[PDB]
Every structure is written in C-alpha cells, then in structure tokens.
Amino acid sequence: AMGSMERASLIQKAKLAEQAERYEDMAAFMKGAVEKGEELSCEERNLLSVAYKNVVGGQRAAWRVLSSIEQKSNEGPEVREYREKVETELQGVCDTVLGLLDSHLIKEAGDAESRVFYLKMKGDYYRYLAEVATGDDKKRIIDSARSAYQEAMDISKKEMPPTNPIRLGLALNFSVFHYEIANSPEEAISLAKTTFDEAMADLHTLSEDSYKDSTLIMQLLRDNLTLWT
Amino acid sequence: AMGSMERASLIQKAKLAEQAERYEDMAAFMKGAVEKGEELSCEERNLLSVAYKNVVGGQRAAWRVLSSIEQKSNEGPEVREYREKVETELQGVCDTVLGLLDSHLIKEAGDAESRVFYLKMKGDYYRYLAEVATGDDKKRIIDSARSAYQEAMDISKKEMPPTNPIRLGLALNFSVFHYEIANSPEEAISLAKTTFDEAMADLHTLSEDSYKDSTLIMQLLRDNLTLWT
Amino acid sequence: AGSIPGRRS
Amino acid sequence: AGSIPGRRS
C-alpha cells in the first residue's frame, strides 16, 4: 500500500502518527518501511514495535471485554459473533507482524540487539495468538511462542549484560508467558527473581541514564513478583 | 455494508462496541441501523451520537496535533501531507453523518426531542467541518452550522423547558460555535449566561434525577463563562 | 472552551 | 501480571 512513498517519509510519518496517537496509521507506515527491504535501525525497530503493540493492545482489551460478556451469558448469537469478529481482526494483525518478522527481518538480523529484539517480538505475537486460541492449534501456538522466547533468551544470556533493557524486557515477557499461558507459575517466579537479582548485581557498571533505563524494567519484574508471591 | 444484519442485532452490537471502546465499529453498526429506514428511539439516537462523536473526536485531536507541528515548521512535505490525510478522513466522517441526517433522519423527525437532537447534530458536524475549513467555502460551512443551530434553538425555546438536557447542550454548543468559529465572544457569553439563568429558575420543577441531569450541563456552561470572563 | 463531551452513553 | 508496556517511543 505504501510502495510509492519514500522510506524516510514513511519513518517521518510514523513518528508524526505516534505524536497524534494514530497507531493504526503508525503501524501501516512502519509496515511500508519494513517492506522496503532494508534492515531497521534501533530507533526504527522501536517504532515498529510501539505501533503494533498499541494496535494489538486495543484489540486485546476489546476481546477481553467481549469474552467476559460472552461468558456471563453462558451461565442471541450477537455477543459471540462480535467477539469472533474482534478475534479475527486481532489474529490478522498478529499474523501480519509475524509475517514481517519472517519476511525477512529475522533472517537478516545478525547483531545480538536486533536478533533478540525481533525474536522477543515473535514470542510476544504468538503469545497474543495463544491468548485467544482454543482448538487444534493452541498447543502448537504456545510452543511457537516458547521457542522464539527461548532462542532470544539463549542469545541474550551469551551476548548482552544482565542489565540490558531488551534482555530484561524479554525475561519479563517470557515470565508472563510462563505464568499466564504455559501454566508454569513457578518457572515464571524463578525467572523473574533470577533476572532481577543478576541485574541488581550489574547496576554498579552503569551510567546515570542507563541505571534509570534498567531499574525501570527491574521494577516491573518486582511488581510481578509481588503479585505472584 | 450492514445490509444483511438485523436492525436489532446492529443496535445490540453498537452497545457491545461501546462497552469495548470500539467506536469505529459502533459508528458503522449505527450507520447500518439508520440505513434500515426506521426512525430512531431516544436511546438509539444517543448511540448514534456517542459513536460518531468519539470517532470525530479522535480525528479532531489528531488534526490539532498535526496542525500545530505544521505551523511550527512554517516559521519536507510530510507534515502537511499527513495533516491533509487526517483532515480528509475527518471531512469524510462529517459528510457521512450529515448524509444520514439528510437521508432521511431530519425530514422524518416530527417530535421536538428528535428534531432538536438531529439539528444540533447537524450544527455540530458543520462546526467540525468549519474548524478545518479555509478556502472558498469556509463562510458557507459556518453559515450552514449557524442555520442548523438556529432552527434547533427556535424549536427548543418553543417546545422544551429551559432545563431540558438537549436544550441545554444545544445552547452550550451553539455558544462554543459563537466563541470559537463565528468570532462572536459576546454572543457566546450572553447565550451561556441567559441559558444558565433560565435553567436555574426552572430547577424547582424537577425530580432528584432530572435535577442531576440538568445541573451537570449547567456546570459546563458555567465552566465556559469562567474561562471567557 | 468545552462543548458537550458526549462520549459516553 | 504486567508485560512490557511498550506503548510509548
């Protein structure tokens, strides 16, 4: 759709759409930028991620409202039909993101910071698919999420310091995967605790600004541990 | 688009979309309900109004962000181009609502409560068009807004008590039209003051619940007067 | 200057 | 249980 617009204009307009809180537009502009075929810079990867997280975040919130109403009514077809419509739209957005990662962001990502970033994305969007999955494929979707997160974890442990914000956010979301999707709360708690403690021990190496970035995500791990224990 | 869905299902799904904060869907469902050709009940009119007010409210907020950036830069073509895109989308939504009012909500509205409601809508969506208008037609758009508001005022003064919430909200928005669009702040202040005072003098006639409905909108008039004086 | 919020019903 | 908010950048 964005084939006729310059890559740099797409990136500029994604930033404008973020300022305007027009996240559907933002995601379309970043989809167009990815489809130009060039690798993405650190800032550009964040724009891609912020755009789709906002879009699918709104869809997930709507799906949960409608699923709750639907469950209350099972204690006409309209509530189920409308939940299905929202669910289909959500799955389509997740499939679009996964398609961008597979064609061809992940395979061209050689540096640890890009490869871990995209694989965390892959785990997250399969996790969103798993949230609404029921039938023949819920297990395969869950294992796809797990496998992406696991590969990202293995790279992040080898290549990044324990305070790296992408490494910390990956561990946070993998722990949420364990708790909420995989029915493994003990694994979720262990991962969040070990991640927090190894970050704490590395904080002394950081500048004032890096310290702020890392401790912010460490607080999210602690918030989860407080909720889980 | 909604031609194959039952009217009552469209209304039920508009209520669901409101709960899910899916206002674009809400507006499409209510557009489909209007296009069934039957008059709308009081509740249904409110659903129609809430849906499009939320949609165009988001577009107006985005347009203002982008217009502000555009003005700062005039002190590449991307900011102007993107503001134009948002502006075109906003105008299309306003035209869609005005089309529903013209085909055929207004002409079939015989009771004061429905006719004033739709004419206030007509004034509001021309006001939104006037906010972004510049060229050959800004004056004609402004006069279209004025004329709709004026007809609604004339009916509301003849047919409704001074505390009627639709009469009060019409006067509120016509006063905003005067202040913000027509460059007539004195007319805006006079209208809001006279509306407030005549409502105050009628409050003694109301039940506890009606009193709450009326005093809430009176407070909005007072908030404007405080800002304007 | 506030118009009718009109965003909830 | 909160994942990365990830909604602002």
Ligand SMILES: *Cc1ccc(C(=O)N2CCC[C@@H](O)C2)cc1
């Ligand atoms: C998944 C994820 C993890 C962490 C962040 C984050 O907070 N930052 C801030 C500073 C460095 C950025 O690359 C990422 C965002 C997403």
Ligand SMILES: *Cc1ccc(C(=O)N2CCC[C@@H](O)C2)cc1
């Ligand atoms: C335009 C407008 C004016 C007033 C309202 C409002 O507050 N209510 C509450 C109770 C009666 C309803 O018909 C309208 C909404 C929109």
Ligand SMILES: [Ca+2]
């Ligand atoms: Ca080029």
Ligand SMILES: [Ca+2]
């Ligand atoms: Ca029918």
Ligand SMILES: [Cl-]
């Ligand atoms: Cl539906």
Ligand SMILES: [Cl-]
């Ligand atoms: Cl590469």
Ligand SMILES: [Cl-]
């Ligand atoms: Cl554009």
Ligand SMILES: [Cl-]
């Ligand atoms: Cl009639």
